[PDB]
Design a protein around this ligand. Structure first.
Ligand SMILES: O=C(O)CCC(=O)C(=O)O
Ligand SMILES: [Mn+2]
Length: 328
């Protein structure tokens, strides 16, 4: 067994299905079968595991070392990693996070135009950049494949999902959780606001998920060599909950935990519409502008951040009513 389950936590140990993703998804009968089997795993368990190739496993090991190095920095070398235009940077709460949003230079056209959330990432040095960025380029390649497989298994119109993620606002949440000695939680029960979540953890362990109802909590054990995938609120909105939005909570174990939360997202300028085929005939009139969706939550979950104060003081929430921030 193992019992790597954090202490004082009642849950069922989960037996997950690992899958091996192609490097190049083409629409072959094998890809369609793999997609439909993965769709079945998300509808029965709410989460599934994907095997890492040796290249993917090495980028993950390089990125896992860089994270321990950042959190090993002094409490003020870390606090100085904040930008006035980007939500990227360090947060300390009882986890600690370093979020990597789209790293855009000061002279980039969308940064010059004061678009909300757009700006350069506050790296301590190029030694955290090369590692985590190369992991995000590999995780991005997996995100596009995972979406193509959902398209083939839900028999969706080709490029129904990959058309929104061209210039996707993919972001990574580099997580470190403390030991148990809130006052007893890492993160409470919550669902992800995005499309897909590719997650990774070390051997300590502490993730719990809630599977989709048939017609209690499940502990996700740390299997080496694999990463987990579960969908978010945007996927549930597009699919009329045919693919779920998995609720999940993180508990503190007897050691410190190091984890990664990758969000494969639509473009900041994407207008996500529901899939009519999966709404029995009547799709809602509601559409979600991802840029507004993202800005509203981050100017909300991080309300006293100087990134949020500058948006209200430069009225950047107005560029969101402009059509150029709504056309990809
Ligand atoms: O906090 C989350 O939403 C994901 C955390 C995670 O990936 C983990 O602890 O394994
Ligand atoms: Mn989450």
């Amino acid at each position: 067994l193992g019992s790597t389950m954090p202490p004082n936590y009642v849950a069922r140990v989960g037996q997950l299905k690992t899958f091996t993703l192609p490097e190049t998804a083409t629409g072959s009968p094998s890809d369609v079968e793999l997609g439909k089997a993965m769709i079945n795993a998300w509808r029965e368990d709410g989460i599934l595991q994907v095997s890492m190739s040796p290249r993917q496993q090495a980028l993950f090991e390089n990125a896992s070392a860089a994270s321990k190095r950042f959190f090993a920095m002094p409490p003020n070398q870390k606090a100085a990693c904040v930008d006035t235009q980007s939500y990227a940077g360090y947060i300390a709460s009882y986890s600690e996070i370093f979020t990597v949003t789209k790293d855009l230079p000061l002279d980039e056209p969308r940064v010059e135009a004061k678009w909300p959330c757009h700006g350069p990432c506050p790296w301590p040095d190029v030694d955290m950049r090369t590692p985590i960025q190369q992991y995000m380029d590999s995780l991005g390649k997996s995100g596009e494949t995972l979406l193509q497989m959902i398209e083939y298994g839900l028999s969706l119109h080709p490029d129904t999902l990959t058309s929104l993620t061209k210039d996707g606002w993919h972001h990574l949440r580099i997580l470190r959780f403390p030991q148990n000695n809130k006052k007893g939680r890492g993160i409470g029960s919550h669902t992800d606001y995005g499309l897909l979540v590719i997650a990774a953890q070390d051997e300590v362990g502490g993730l719990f998920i809630r599977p989709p109802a048939d017609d209690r909590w499940v502990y996700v054990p740390p299997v080496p060599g694999v990463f987990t995938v579960f969908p978010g609120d945007i996927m549930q909105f597009m699919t009329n909950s045919y693919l779920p939005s998995t609720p999940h909570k993180v508990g503190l174990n007897t050691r410190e935990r190091f984890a990664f939360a990758y969000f494969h997202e639509p473009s900041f300028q994407a207008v996500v519409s529901p899939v009519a085929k999966l709404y029995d005939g009547q799709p809602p009139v509601e559409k979600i502008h991802y840029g507004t969706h993202f800005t509203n939550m981050f100017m909300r979950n991080y309300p006293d951040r100087i990134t949020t104060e500058r948006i209200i003081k430069e009225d950047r929430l107005q560029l969101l009513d402009r059509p150029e921030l709504r056309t990809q």
